[PDB]
């Protein structure tokens, strides 16, 4: 599976979660930002590596980072 990490520059705009087409990310409560929410990735075994969440992230040097690792049927997006 691929690794999705969320760093402490997250400002809780939820745009990475909205952009994710495979339901990898949620928003959990937090205290480090004014929105008081941070993105989380409990479902990285369903992550395909499309990096739409990275494209959606507005913080300069994005607070969400996707690292392509071990390749599975789910991660290669195979319907067969």
């Amino acid at each position: 599976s691929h690794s999705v990490k969320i760093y402490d520059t997250c400002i809780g705009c939820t745009q990475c979660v909205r952009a994710c087409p495979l339901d990898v990310l949620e928003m959990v409560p937090w205290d480090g930002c004014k929105a008081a929410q941070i993105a989380s990735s409990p479902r990285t075994e369903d992550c395909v590596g499309c990096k739409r969440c990275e494209t959606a992230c507005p913080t300069d040097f994005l607070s969400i980072r996707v690292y392509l690792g071990a390749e599975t049927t789910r991660s290669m997006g195979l319907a067969y």
């Binding site: 691929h2 992550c47 395909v48 590596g49 499309c50 990096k51 739409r52 996707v66 392509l68 390749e71 991660s75 290669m76 997006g77």
Partner: peptide, 9 residues
């Protein structure tokens, strides 16, 4: 594309 994922698209 839709990113390097799914093998590469």
């Amino acid at each position: 594309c839709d990113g390097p994922g799914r093998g590469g698209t």
